[PDB]
Design an enzyme around this catalytic site. Structure first.
Site, PDB file in Angstrom:
ATOM      1  N   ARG A 116     -15.658  -1.084   1.178  1.00 51.75           N
ATOM      2  CA  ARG A 116     -14.753  -1.778   2.100  1.00 51.75           C
ATOM      3  C   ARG A 116     -15.438  -1.957   3.449  1.00 51.75           C
ATOM      4  NH1 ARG A 116      -8.642  -1.674   3.246  1.00 51.75           N
ATOM      5  NH2 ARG A 116      -9.502  -3.694   3.903  1.00 51.75           N
ATOM      6  N   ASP A 118      -8.249   4.713   2.731  1.00 49.56           N
ATOM      7  CA  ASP A 118      -8.801   4.912   4.080  1.00 49.56           C
ATOM      8  C   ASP A 118      -9.028   6.379   4.389  1.00 49.56           C
ATOM      9  OD1 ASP A 118      -8.324   2.142   4.521  1.00 49.56           O
ATOM     10  OD2 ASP A 118      -6.517   2.552   5.755  1.00 49.56           O
ATOM     11  N   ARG A 172      -6.368  -9.137  15.648  1.00 48.83           N
ATOM     12  CA  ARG A 172      -5.328  -8.831  14.675  1.00 48.83           C
ATOM     13  C   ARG A 172      -4.068  -8.382  15.407  1.00 48.83           C
ATOM     14  NH1 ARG A 172      -5.860  -4.545   9.583  1.00 48.83           N
ATOM     15  NH2 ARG A 172      -3.616  -4.149   9.263  1.00 48.83           N
ATOM     16  N   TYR A 219     -11.182  -8.265   4.312  1.00 50.45           N
ATOM     17  CA  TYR A 219     -11.978  -8.180   5.539  1.00 50.45           C
ATOM     18  C   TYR A 219     -13.242  -9.026   5.383  1.00 50.45           C
ATOM     19  CZ  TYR A 219      -9.304  -4.303   7.787  1.00 50.45           C
ATOM     20  OH  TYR A 219      -8.353  -3.511   8.420  1.00 50.45           O
TER      21      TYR A 219
HETATM   22  C1  LIG Z   1      -9.567   3.694  10.787  1.00 50.05           C
HETATM   23  C2  LIG Z   1      -8.654   2.952   9.790  1.00 50.05           C
HETATM   24  O1  LIG Z   1      -7.626   3.486   9.339  1.00 50.05           O
HETATM   25  N1  LIG Z   1      -9.044   1.681   9.475  1.00 50.05           N
HETATM   26  C3  LIG Z   1      -8.331   0.792   8.528  1.00 50.05           C
HETATM   27  C4  LIG Z   1      -7.250  -0.115   9.189  1.00 50.05           C
HETATM   28  C5  LIG Z   1      -6.033   0.677   9.775  1.00 50.05           C
HETATM   29  O2  LIG Z   1      -5.542   1.653   8.846  1.00 50.05           O
HETATM   30  C6  LIG Z   1      -4.901  -0.265  10.292  1.00 50.05           C
HETATM   31  O3  LIG Z   1      -5.464  -1.212  11.219  1.00 50.05           O
HETATM   32  C7  LIG Z   1      -3.749   0.553  10.898  1.00 50.05           C
HETATM   33  O4  LIG Z   1      -4.206   1.446  11.937  1.00 50.05           O
HETATM   34  O5  LIG Z   1      -6.649  -1.001   8.233  1.00 50.05           O
HETATM   35  C8  LIG Z   1      -7.038  -1.062   6.798  1.00 50.05           C
HETATM   36  O6  LIG Z   1      -6.304  -0.065   6.124  1.00 50.05           O
HETATM   37  C9  LIG Z   1      -6.489  -2.500   6.292  1.00 50.05           C
HETATM   38  O7  LIG Z   1      -5.616  -3.086   6.999  1.00 50.05           O
HETATM   39  O8  LIG Z   1      -6.981  -2.904   5.191  1.00 50.05           O
HETATM   40  C10 LIG Z   1      -8.569  -0.820   6.637  1.00 50.05           C
HETATM   41  C11 LIG Z   1      -9.320  -0.102   7.772  1.00 50.05           C
HETATM   42  O9  LIG Z   1     -10.385   0.766   7.314  1.00 50.05           O
END
Ligand SMILES: CC(=O)N[C@H]1[C@H]([C@H](O)[C@H](O)CO)O[C@@](O)(C(=O)O)C[C@@H]1O
Length: 363
Positions: free
Chosen positions: A18, A43, A226, A328
């Site tokens: 990812r 995550d 975003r 992404y």
């Molecule tokens: C550090 C972290 O969590 N990064 C993640 C963010 C946050 O979870 C959101 O922006 C909410 O904070 O979003 C993802 O889950 C998503 O939207 O696919 C992937 C990404 O790796």
């Protein structure tokens, strides 16, 4: 499209990849990065950051682990969500968020997340070797103007930029304790000493803004960010290197992102042969809504012809994203070439989009 990181055939036996990143180097080398999500899409899990490097313009690739997590927790240790930049010396900087416990970085704790840090590495040999990890948050010596009510922060996920005088600017995202709630905001950090030390700017005008990138435009900073649950990417402009912001109308609300949460995208500047500055944005159209994040598209605006509406140029990934984690993307433009990396059903794929840039360049 080339499968750059393959969940079904990779040297780490990782189940998922990812958060891709790409830099096109001045000498034609292509440098990419991705989360190695060893145990699945989650995550909050065990994650290192890989690099993939190519000297034959994307035909073949050398793979390495560019940054390892703190190795404290075999389930939750993670470095992730790469933000990169190439400085005027050619130094390549990578900034990642680091945790080692369960729970969303921005909303889990009401005080500074105790396992949270921002880690930085740099390469002075074009991506072949990296410095040791430099911890930007364990003390007050590396990042000035960090708010006292910080829960955490990390990069904007994508690429930074270099101003005219060589100032390095990184998009960032912060979580702040405000009136017994946690609110998250975009902002930038900048460095005037080739990445050794940084100054944090101030937050943008709306909360629920997070992953973002900025371009430079005549000394101004323009952000595409975003903006969760609005249905669109917000846009702001700063004339004082990120100290204050106002809505940037030509881009604000112009890239729609469908029902539900927002999604990371990328935003870069190109100058076409007629001298026009154009902005290119990659993001899912998300016509099917929420985390489906279908159709990663590339959009163009002409800053020297603003009455012309934002145009869809092409759709590099005309497919549904995987709800487990997809959507992404990251563009990189250099020396009239244009490349993209993006999420594709648990893999990262790569495309050279230079033929579309030639269509825009009209030569
Ligand atoms: C550090 C972290 O969590 N990064 C993640 C963010 C946050 O979870 C959101 O922006 C909410 O904070 O979003 C993802 O889950 C998503 O939207 O696919 C992937 C990404 O790796």
């Amino acid at each position: 499209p080339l499968i750059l990181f393959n969940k079904d055939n990779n040297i780490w036996n990782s189940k998922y990849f990812r958060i891709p990143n790409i830099q096109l180097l001045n000498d034609g080398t292509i440098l990419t990065f991705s989360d190695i999500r060893y145990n699945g899409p989650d995550d909050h899990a065990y994650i290192d950051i890989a690099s993939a490097r190519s000297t034959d313009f994307g035909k073949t690739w050398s793979y390495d682990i560019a940054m390892k997590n703190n190795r404290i927790d075999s389930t939750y240790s993670r470095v992730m969500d790469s933000t990169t930049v190439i400085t005027n010396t050619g130094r390549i900087i990578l900034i990642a968020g680091s945790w080692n416990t369960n729970g969303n970085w921005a909303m889990t704790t009401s005080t500074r997340r105790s396992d949270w840090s921002v880690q930085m590495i740099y390469s002075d040999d074009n991506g072949l070797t990296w410095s040791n990890k430099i911890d930007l948050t364990k003390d007050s010596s590396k990042v000035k103007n960090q708010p006292s009510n910080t829960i955490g922060w990390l990069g904007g996920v994508g690429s930074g930029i270099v101003m005219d005088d060589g100032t390095i600017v990184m998009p960032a995202q912060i979580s702040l304790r405000e009136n017994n709630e946690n609110n998250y905001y975009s902002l930038i950090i900048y460095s005037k000493d080739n990445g050794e030390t940084w100054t944090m700017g101030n937050k943008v005008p709306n909360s629920n803004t997070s992953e973002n990138m900025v371009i430079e435009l005549d000394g101004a900073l323009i952000m595409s960010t975003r903006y969760d649950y609005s249905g669109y990417r917000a846009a702001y402009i700063s004339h004082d290197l990120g100290s204050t912001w106002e809505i940037y109308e030509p881009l604000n609300g112009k890239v729609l992102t469908g029902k539900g949460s927002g999604c990371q995208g990328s935003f870069i500047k190109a100058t076409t042969s007629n001298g026009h500055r154009i902005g290119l944005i990659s993001a899912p159209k998300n016509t099917k809504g929420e985390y489906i994040r279908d159709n990663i598209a590339v959009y163009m605006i002409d800053f020297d012809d603003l009455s012309k509406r934002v145009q869809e140029i092409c759709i590099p990934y005309p497919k549904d994203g995987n709800k487990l984690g997809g959507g992404y993307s990251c563009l990189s433009f250099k020396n009239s070439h244009l490349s993209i990396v993006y999420e594709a059903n648990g893999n990262i794929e790569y495309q050279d989009l230079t033929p579309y840039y030639s269509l825009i360049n009209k030569q």
